[PDB]
């Protein structure tokens, strides 16, 4: 009934339906088109007011794409596999000035996804969680978006209990990737100037 309200089968179908820095930007450019294709296949998304649909996509696009290419790169050694088949390696990243954030995607997203063997269904659900964010400004009815998000929580937990019955904390483990994804998304959005811009704490700890 939790799955019936938000079928993880549809969410899966949605996922299956869709300078090194220059490479990356061209890759994002490519996938931008997929976003509405994917979203329309997420149960009940198409039932939200058209204005609300635009708002959710506008708010979640970067975290949505980042999550996608991270899970895609689980097979890569020290880099990522773009939607254009190209590879970006750690080295190339550091030499272009974006080493820190690149490294963060690798450790917090890619490797964690590899290590826990996050499945495409799990990825899909996390993306639906990112998508259904009620806090974005201008939403016609936030309660409705919040309601759908919670249907994903219910549906995902159910999915994890049944598919991974002897991992009782896997659900929590999936959600706990989201804080990191949010921080990374914000970093990737912050503009040039801000992007490129000790004693008293030690004192207090030692007292």
């Amino acid at each position: 009934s939790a799955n019936e309200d938000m079928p993880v089968e549809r969410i899966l179908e949605a996922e299956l339906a869709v300078d090194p820095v220059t490479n990356i930007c061209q890759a994002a450019d490519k996938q931008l088109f997929t976003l509405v294709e994917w979203a329309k296949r997420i149960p009940h998304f198409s039932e939200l007011p058209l204005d609300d649909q635009v708002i959710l996509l506008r708010a979640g696009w970067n975290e949505l794409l980042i999550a996608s290419f991270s899970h895609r790169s689980i097979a890569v050694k020290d880099g990522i596999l773009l939607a254009t088949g190209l590879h970006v390696h750690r080295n190339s990243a550091h030499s272009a000035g974006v080493g820190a954030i690149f490294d963060r995607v690798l450790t917090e997203l890619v490797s964690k996804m590899r290590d826990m063997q996050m499945d495409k269904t799990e990825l899909g659900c996390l993306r639906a969680i990112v998508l259904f964010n009620p806090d974005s400004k201008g939403l016609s009815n936030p309660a409705e978006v919040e309601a759908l998000r919670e249907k994903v929580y219910a549906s995902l937990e159910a999915y994890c209990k049944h598919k991974y019955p002897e991992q009782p904390g896997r659900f929590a483990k999936l959600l706990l990737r989201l804080p990191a994804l949010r921080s990374i998304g914000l970093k990737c959005l912050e503009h040039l100037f801000f992007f490129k811009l000790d004693t008293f704490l030690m004192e207090m700890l030692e007292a």
């Binding site: 706990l176 989201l178 030690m202």
Partner: protein
């Protein structure tokens, strides 16, 4: 279920918060008083409200440090890791403690019992609306959750033990420590909110919101530089740098 071990741990956490906070309360006179000055264009009055607010914040950070020191496993981390954890989680814990003190009736926030402030009070100190509003919205939202002392304490512990903070060396160990509180909170909410299993996910998602709020805060920090409104040494160290 919750083991006696886990119930004990939770009690320890909550007692630590009470202890830390009673130390804050008796430090309360160290804070520059709130001006009674009648003139909204007084720049001296503005500065003094800012002095008052930043000094309250310092008390908060002090309480947060005192609390972390009592978390099992924290002092066993390298000092570098203790500092990497506290530097970035301070604003998040301060936000959680703040939401805890939001009054929906008057739409105000009360610190140390005697200092109550509404949105306009915070603006009279020179804080920008895009800092003020999201924090009031976060507070209301948290207030809606109706969390108790146990649930705040665990969520605060989970926030502190976030391995993805910049500069954390021993991420494995920080996650292992966080996982204890996560598991405990989960058992706690399934036991105490048996008809609302969604309470657990609702809470963990607050950690996501705190990330956005941390970025909002950093934008307010910068905005302050533009007014040349300087942060106290402690706050400058943890946030300006």
């Amino acid at each position: 279920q919750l083991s006696p071990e886990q119930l004990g741990m939770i009690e320890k956490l909550v007692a630590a918060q009470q202890q830390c906070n009673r130390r804050s309360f008796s430090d309360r006179l160290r804070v520059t008083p709130w001006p009674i000055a009648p003139d909204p264009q007084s720049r001296e009055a503005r500065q003094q409200r800012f002095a008052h607010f930043t000094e309250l914040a310092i008390v908060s950070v002090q309480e947060i440090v005192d609390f972390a020191k009592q978390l099992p496993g924290f002092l066993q981390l390298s000092r570098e890791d203790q500092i990497a954890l506290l530097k970035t989680s301070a604003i998040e814990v301060m936000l959680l403690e703040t939401s805890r003190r939001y009054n929906p009736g008057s739409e105000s926030i009360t610190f140390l019992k005697d200092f109550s402030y509404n949105r306009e009070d915070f603006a009279k100190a020179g804080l920008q609306v895009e800092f003020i509003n999201p924090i009031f919205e976060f507070s209301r939202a948290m207030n809606e959750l109706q969390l108790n002392d146990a649930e705040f304490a665990l969520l605060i512990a989970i926030s502190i033990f976030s391995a993805d903070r910049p500069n954390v060396q021993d991420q494995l160990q920080v996650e292992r420590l966080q996982h204890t509180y996560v598991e405990a909170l989960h058992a706690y909410v399934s036991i105490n909110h048996p008809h609302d299993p969604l309470m657990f996910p609702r809470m963990l998602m607050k950690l996501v919101s705190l990330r956005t709020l941390s970025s909002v805060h950093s934008e307010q920090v910068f905005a302050l530089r533009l007014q040349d409104k300087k942060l106290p040494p402690l706050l400058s160290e943890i946030w300006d740098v």
